[PDB]
Each structure stands twice: as C-alpha cells, then as structure tokens.
Design a binder for this molecule. Structure first.
Ligand SMILES: *Cc1cc2c(cc1C)nc1c(=O)[nH]c(=O)nc-1n2C[C@H](O)[C@H](O)[C@H](O)COP(=O)(O)OP(=O)(O)OC[C@H]1O[C@@H](n2cnc3c(N)ncnc32)[C@H](O)[C@@H]1O
Ligand SMILES: *Cc1cc2c(cc1C)nc1c(=O)[nH]c(=O)nc-1n2C[C@H](O)[C@H](O)[C@H](O)COP(=O)(O)OP(=O)(O)OC[C@H]1O[C@@H](n2cnc3c(N)ncnc32)[C@H](O)[C@@H]1O
Ligand SMILES: CCCCCCCCCCCC[N+](C)(C)[O-]
Ligand SMILES: CCCCCCCCCCCC[N+](C)(C)[O-]
Lengths: 494, 497
C-alpha cells in the first residue's frame, strides 16, 4: 500500500520516507541490506560499547542533520581537541595548535597561504546549485587536481599537504579527480577552513550512541513500512502505476519513486523503458572513493598525559594512515584512536590480514606519539567500504575530468515518475550525512509538488541555524588576505 | 543442460559458446536482448537491403574474426578507396592520396611526423599482455591524453589532428582518457598506420551481408541453446554448482560461467557472495564511449564521378561528423555515406530529431564534397549506442586517468568459477570484433583447462594468418625515422649558437 516507493534505506531515503509519511502519504522503503543506515553503520558490542564504522562527524552549518537528529532524540558531544595536534613530517613529530600546521620558512609560508587561499578564491566562482555554470567550467573540469596542484604550488611541502588534503576529503587521488568538481566539493561545505576544522568545523562533534541511531529511529516511526533484505532489481514505468520489483520476487506499485541510492548504483536496476541516454551513460561515469576506517582501542587515553589531543596529520607514502582523530567516548571510557587508510593505500593494504594492519597502525601511532603504550592495543575494529556491494565505496562519489560539465545536470533530473535523492545530489555539504538530509527532503517535496500539494516555491527550503551548535563565522588575517604568492613576490622584483 | 553458462550473446559469448560446444560440452547462452550480436547489429529492410548499424569493418592482422567468419560461410569485400580522399580544413576541401592528409608547411610537417612517430615510440614500451608493467606506467597513466598532446604538439594543426584521432578511435575526449591506456590501445592494434588505414589497415573490408551474420549463424549451430530475452540478474556461488538467475525468473545451474558482457555491465548482476573488493570497484570505474552511427543513402555514388572516393576527414567543432567512409554495396547498389557523430557531439546532437540530424549531415556533405546532390537523400538510418542499456556505449570501454594501473589486472582475473571474456579483455585488437573472438575463445579454453581437458600451455593460442586477406607489413621512410621534432630542431640550431 504505497503512494511513493523509496529505494534506499540510508539517511537520505529515511529522511524522505519520513517527510512524506508526516504529510499523510503511504510510503514504503525497500532496502537491500539487513539493516538501515547504509554508509552509516554503528557497531555495538561489549569491548566497544558502540562505534561508528561509517559516517560519523557533524559540525556547525550542518543544520539539517543536527535538526533531524535532535527531533529523533539524539545528542552530540565534542570530539576531543583540548590538547596539542601533531604534524608528523619527514620522520619527526611537531606539535601545534589551531587548524593548520605551522610553517616556518618564509618562502614556503607564502606558498602555503596562497594555496589555501586560491582554493577558496576559485571556489567563489562556482555555484553550488550548478557548478557547470562556472565561468571557467570547461577549463577547470578538463583538468585534474594533480595538474592544478602542479601549477599552483611552488614548494614541495605545499604540494604534499595539498595532496593529503585532497586524499583525505574525497578518498581519491589528485590525478583521479576533476579540478572543477573538487573545488565545488570544498566550496559547498564552506571552504577550506570549515571543511578541515575540528573545533568550529566539520569534525567538531559526534552523536552520543552512534549515527546509525538516526535511520534506525526513523525505521521505528515507520513500523512495518521499511522492508529489509529487499534489493530492487527492476523498475517498470510503461503502465499507469510504477512497478518496482525486488530480488526475492515481491512486486510493489506506486504513483512515484525516490531513488536514494548512490548514483552509480542505479546500474543495479533494470529499467523499462530504457533510461534516457544521458542518465544511462552518466551512471557509468561516477565512481565512489576508497577508504578503510580503523579504530584501535587502548586501556587509557595515554596521549593526553603527553599533552597530545590525539590528532595526527601524517605526511609520506610509507605511513598507512595520514589522519587520525581521538575516538574516546565523552566519559574517559573506551579510549581509542580513529584513522583512515585512504585511496591507493586502501587497495594496497587490503591485501594484508586484519592483524597485520593492526600491527602497522600501532607501530605508526607509537612512532608519531612517541610512546611504547601504543604498541599495546586492548581491541581493534575496521571497515573496508571498498567491498560493500550496495555502497560501492566511501565516503561519496567523485567525478573524473570532463564528466561534471557533460553529465552534471543529469544527477537530479527526474525520469518520469522517478525522483533522485541521496547525498550526491545535495548542494550544501553534499558528500556528508547533512547532504543526505537535504537531498532526501527535497526529493520528497518534489513529489509533494507534483501531486499539487505544495507550490514550486516550497521545494527547496532553507533551514534555521542550530541553537546547540551555533556557527562561528570564518575570518581571515589582513596578512593572510594580502601576502604575495611565490610568483607574485618574484614579480615584486622583476 | 549446462556444463558452462555463457552470459552475453555477442560475438565474444558466441565465439566461446561454440568452442566449448565443438569440444563436446553442454553450454547455454543467456542473452538479455531479443537478438544476438550486441554491439554488432545488421538492419535488414527494403530501402537498405542490409546495413551495419554497429560493428562493421575488418582488416589485415584481424585473423581470428576473419577465420571464424570464413568457417561460418561469410565473405568480405573491399571498402571503397579507389578515388581521392578529402581533408576538409578551415572551411575548404583538399583532396589527397595515402593514409595521412599531407601537410605543406615544413615546421608543421616536422611536428606532425614527430607526433605520429612518438605515439608509436611510447607504445613500443607497453606490453599488450599487461600495459600496467610499462616502465613509466604510473606517470603515463596519471596523465590524460590532452595533457600528453599539450606537451607533445608544437603546432595547433597537429594538436587538432591528434585530437580527432583520439575522438575517432575511442569515442571519448582527450581529457577523458588516460594516456597510458590510449597508447596501449593504439599499439595493441599494430600502431598508428595500422589503426588509421583503410587500404591495408583496420577499415579495409566489410562482410557481405552484414556482421550480425557472425553471431546469428552461431545461434543456428546451437539450436535451442541460445535463450533470448534472458537478462541475467543474480549469480550465486555459495553451493557446489553455480546458480544463474534471469529477470523473468528462470534458474540455470552450471559448473562454470563465462561473463562476456562489457566490464561495467556486471554492475547489473547481483552477486553472492559479494565480489572481491577489487572487481566490485573496478566495474564502476570503466565507462564506454559515445557515438551515433549515421548512414545517408543516395540515388548514385555521385562523389565518384568527381573523383572523390567518399572518405572525408573533417576538422573543426561546428561539423557534426569528423570522419566518413563510403558505404555503397559492392555492386554499385544502394549508394551511401557512413559517418560517426563522436564523443561530446553525440551528446549535443542527440537533442535534435532524426530529421534535423539528417539535414545537418547533408548540408555538411554538400559543403565538403561541393555538390548539391548531397542535399537529396533517398533514405536515412542511424543508431545512437549511448542509449543502449545492455551496451552502455560504443565502440568499447575507456579508462580514465589512474584506473588502468590500479584496476588493470582485475579485468580478466577469474572469480571462483566465473571467467571473463568480452573484447575489452583481448590483447590484440581489443575494442574490435577481432578482440571479441580472442577473448571469447581464451575464456572458453580457460574452463577447458580447469576441467583438466587441455594443458595450461594451450589456453592462449596463436592464429594462422588469413589467406584471403594477407597482411602487408608496415614500413617507414628513412626521412620519417630521422627528421627532428620541432624542439629537436630548435636544439639542432642552438648547437651552432
Ligand atoms: C563510509 C564513509 C562515509 C562517511 C564517513 C566515513 C566513511 C568511512 N564519514 C562521514 C563523516 O564523518 N561525516 C559525514 O557527514 N558523513 C560521513 N560519511 C559519508 C556519509 O556516510 C554519507 O554522506 C551518507 O551516509 C550518505 O547517505 P545516503 O542515504 O545518501 O547514501 P547511503 O547511506 O549509501 O544509502 C543508500 C541505501 O540504499 C541501499 N541500496 C543500494 N542499492 C540498493 C538497491 N539496488 N536496492 C535497494 N536498496 C539499495 C543501500 O543499502 C543503502 O542502505
Ligand atoms: C557500436 C560500435 C561498435 C563497433 C563499431 C562501431 C560502433 C558504432 N565499429 C567497429 C568496427 O567497425 N570494427 C570492429 O571490429 N568493431 C566495431 N565495433 C566494436 C565491436 O562491436 C565490439 O568490439 C564487439 O562487438 C564486442 O563484442 P562483445 O561480445 O565482446 O560485447 P557485446 O557485443 O556488447 O556483447 C555482449 C552481449 O551481452 C548482452 N548482455 C549485456 N548485459 C547482459 C545481462 N545483464 N544479462 C544477459 N546478457 C547481457 C548484450 O545484450 C550483448 O548482446
Ligand atoms: C591542513 C591539514 C590537512 C587537512 C586536515 C583536514 C582533514 C580533512 C577531514 C576530512 C574528513 C571528512 N570526513 C568525511 C572524514 O569527515
Ligand atoms: C590521420 C587521419 C585522422 C585519423 C584517421 C583514421 C580514422 C580512425 C578510424 C577508427 C575507426 C575505428 N572503428 C571502430 C570505426 O573501426
């Protein structure tokens, strides 16, 4: 008994399922896996209490997920940043404060500052709405992030940090991704400072008890309406009602469909009539990134006694993990260090066993933190999202050179009675649980409008700022704004 | 009755289905569409007699498809190249002979000759077998064709021809594709001259009566064994026998499976257990190209009376088609001009209607050939492969930067009892009907060897050269081999100063 069938049981699909349900429509969520959540997964066991193996951090400006979470009963806590962060470079650890690791060489400094600034400068020229309408869309999209970096960075030290920055943001290589798309990505989160910041940015907080809780609690509000172990394999739009068919043979009929699965994963559904050419091809050109999330558990948060907060930014090819955060529960309990094994390394180290990875991570953390204690883990958890069939990767989808301009506007164009959600279709914090909410609700409202229940006026809604997580605005030093680039200085002579 | 289930009813799947069948095994071909052939499709109707709307040309060195075709009863005929070809550049038409349009400016000449030569030089370093083992695999793979071209080409005239060359070979933009992969592609066909040549190259000949005939005639040899309208949707390897399930609900059980569908199209099958991480992700990173094949029929082969053979190479953004060949049947009958609408243009002009495209093609062919007669088409056929669900595109699969080195060796690595065919897994003329044969048969022989019926020794077989289409070898002028590059000349005169 269905007005709308939502494909996809993740935050986006649930967010949508709920909005429709709240508005008095009969919905149904068909979910392939034996669990809701998708790219969020909260493991619960005795050694760990709870742990986010998937999507986890939420921050200021991410108002939608914060709102939906509150209403569903959930609370946040601050990720630990009281003590010092560590930038570990060329085999040595240098402690620091603030978002960016400091650089002492005045030339290198000019270069670094210019890089971050130019990402943001370039970004101001790309609309979130429609990145392909950027004045230099063609040029920028026809060129990789590695190219742009090779051009923009006069120092090896800045090329390397920039690379790490790209690797960490989108779990792909700089040579894999289009410049236009990457620049769009960063800007639709609020620029470099917002995206890279723990305190006052994207990694500020986590949900008490896990984020799996979000889509779980929505499943509760919907009773028997969410159907687990139901992978959709066929959508048929020939008749008056849309027929949607699952791998186990059940048939569902609906006036409308929200597809809230990752773009490329539409490949997994057979369509009748065939999809329009643009979409048929678009969905083969949009891969997801590669990451292993790893958590190592320790008797005590030892790092803090050495005045380290747990954050490590680790340069170099040999290091299996480039970025860590402290994962100790808000109490002091269950101390842990979180880390990502990114991009090409997620492929290299997947060859090893669970134990061999644990060993490599510990030896690293031991070197970086300079403490024997890191060699004594009390427990370990990991997830390699590269092997998930109904995910395709993590965190999100990336666009190779040339594809955003050409196939861009396809992603959220309705196909008859199919409407498209999922975070990759958001316009603010796309890539994140936030985007998942934006997209989920907009797609729902699109259907509402088609049924003539709300005006076009009302499809895209703005969101009131959170009271519990107010957003400090981002500011820049006069010197930051005005210092020359390395070439610019060379030009200030001859 | 199933020892091996073949998914994929195209030339590769059939080539395979037959090899196994001839060796006394019970096979089954499960095919999604209501026809075999796949990326070959031969339209038959009264206005046209027959027309290849899909894969069509065969040439010297393409011995496998040539052999399989002969044994199946088929014959070839030469594509028309008797008269002059046309290079149409900056609004004007310049007739010429030989494979390459001539260039007169001595500087530009050096640049052009060096470009073609360097494609081939770089290629000699890449193993067909395993392109990712090239000495400079990382560097080359991390970089797009547009990048390599921007670096290699000192003249705009050469950048443009090189771009067209890329567009035409792989139906993609230079900025879309990895340099390593592209250089591999060209070299596994026999280098630039072989790939671009009509006479004595890849476009020498067509099959009399169509190429759909190839897989069709194999369907005949197999009786009721090919099951049309059967799209596979689930493969299950948990048990002793592999279960394969179709969209209409039928179950098939087999000791082994050949998947002979385009790599990325495996996405369309749900697996149990899940695929290994590498494949699972590989198959999202491997798109197919974009092309519309367009044939315009005329009362007579009028071009020939003007001493033009029908070949047009057309530079420039405004032209909807960059390359045409003469499609007149070997008799003189049903005169026609064949042309491709490539890459980004395939997306742009799909917006228009059948008639609007015809008009644009006619106006172009009229300008290029300089004859009002082109404005008077007697009939028109077209296929836009971009809209094919069970194809994904045409002609073949292309690799974006970074993917070949990382995900390369995954393409033809067995997954338990699944073995992988399809042309994208060939090593000689991959991308082509030839490749489809190579890969089909190798896959089949892989299974044969797993059952201990033939030695490992015998999985990859070499192929005797055709008697009807012998291969003239490729040669180069002394001057071609030794003329400086543009930079090389700049160097050569900076050693007087
Ligand atoms: C995995 C990853 C993601 C991630 C992260 C770290 C990693 C390791 N860290 C994050 C961070 O800390 N902050 C944040 O905001 N997000 C972070 N994420 C990204 C985040 O997980 C995603 O942005 C978000 O969860 C996306 O949600 P969405 O709903 O848009 O996509 P999904 O979660 O994958 O849900 C899709 C559901 O659809 C089901 N599915 C797939 N195919 C089918 C078929 N064919 N039939 C029926 N159902 C299907 C999937 O199973 C899934 O449940
Ligand atoms: C389309 C294109 C191709 C082409 C060409 C021009 C264009 C417009 N010109 C060529 C040229 O002149 N010379 C040449 O040698 N080849 C040319 N081609 C390329 C050529 O067609 C291909 O290289 C070759 O045909 C590839 O064959 P292969 O067998 O390897 O791949 P396929 O033909 O697509 O066959 C696949 C079959 O599998 C079926 N399928 C797909 N999905 C499923 C599922 N899920 N279940 C069951 N069956 C499935 C497809 O329908 C297809 O029949
Ligand atoms: C200049 C420091 C180098 C970059 C530091 C910022 C780390 C980026 C964190 C992005 C993590 C994204 N995600 C999904 C894990 O939240
Ligand atoms: C230097 C002339 C410009 C390139 C001319 C060669 C045309 C390449 C033909 C490739 C066609 C491939 N295919 C599949 C249609 O056979």
């Amino acid at each position: 008994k269905c007005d709308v069938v939502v494909v996809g049981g993740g935050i986006s699909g649930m967010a949508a399922a709920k909005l429709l349900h709240d508005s008095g429509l009969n919905v149904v969520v068909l979910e392939a896996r034996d669990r809701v959540g998708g790219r969020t997964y909260t493991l619960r066991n005795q050694k760990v209490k709870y742990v986010d193996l998937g999507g986890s951090y939420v921050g200021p400006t991410q108002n939608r997920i914060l709102r939906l979470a509150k209403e569903l009963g959930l609370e946040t806590y601050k990720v630990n940043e009281v003590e010092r962060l560590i930038h570990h470079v060329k085999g040595k650890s240098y402690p620091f404060r603030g978002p960016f690791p400091p650089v002492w060489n005045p030339i290198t400094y000019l270069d670094h500052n210019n890089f971050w600034r130019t990402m943001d400068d370039m970004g101001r020229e790309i609309p979130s709405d429609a990145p392909w309408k950027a004045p230099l869309a063609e040029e920028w999209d026809n060129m990789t992030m590695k190219e742009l970096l090779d051009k923009l960075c006069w120092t090896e030290s800045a090329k390397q940090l920039a690379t790490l920055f790209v690797n960490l943001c989108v779990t792909a290589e700089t040579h894999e991704v289009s410049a236009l798309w990457f620049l769009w990505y960063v800007k639709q989160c609020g620029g470099t400072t917002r995206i890279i910041s723990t305190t006052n940015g994207g990694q500020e907080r986590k949900f008490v008890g896990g984020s799996g809780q979000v889509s779980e609690r929505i499943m509760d509000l919907l009773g028997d309406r969410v159907k687990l172990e139901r992978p959709v394999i066929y959508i048929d739009q020939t008749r008056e009602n849309v027929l949607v068919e699952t791998l186990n043979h059940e048939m569902y009929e609906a006036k409308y469909v929200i597809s809230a699965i990752p773009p490329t994963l539409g490949m997994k559904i057979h369509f009748n009539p065939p999809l329009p050419m643009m979409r048929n091809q678009m969905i083969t050109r949009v891969p997801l990134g590669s990451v292993i999330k790893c958590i190592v558990y320790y008797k005590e948060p030892f790092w803090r006694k050495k005045d380290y907060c747990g954050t490590m930014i680790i340069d170099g090819e040999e290091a299996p993990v480039a970025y860590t955060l402290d994962d100790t529960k808000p109490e002091g309990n269950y101390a842990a260090i979180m880390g990502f094994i990114l991009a090409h390394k997620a492929r290299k180290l997947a060859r090893l066993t669970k134990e061999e990875r644990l060993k490599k991570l510990c030896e690293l953390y031991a070197k970086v933190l300079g403490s024997l204690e890191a060699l004594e883990p009390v427990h370990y958890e990991e997830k390699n999202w590269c092997e998930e069939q109904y995910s395709g990767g993590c965190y999100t989808t990336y666009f190779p050179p040339g594809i955003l301009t050409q196939y861009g506007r396809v992603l959220r164009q309705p196909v008859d009675r199919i409407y498209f959600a999922g975070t990759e279709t958001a316009t603010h914090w796309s890539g994140y649980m936030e985007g998942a909410v934006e997209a989920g609700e907009r797609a729902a409202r699109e259907i509402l409008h088609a049924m003539g229940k709300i005006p076009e006026d009302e499809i895209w809604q703005s969101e009131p700022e959170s009271v519990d997580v107010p957003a400090q605005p981002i500011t820049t030093t006069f010197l930051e704004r005005h210092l020359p680039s390395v070439p610019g200085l060379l030009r200030l002579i001859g």
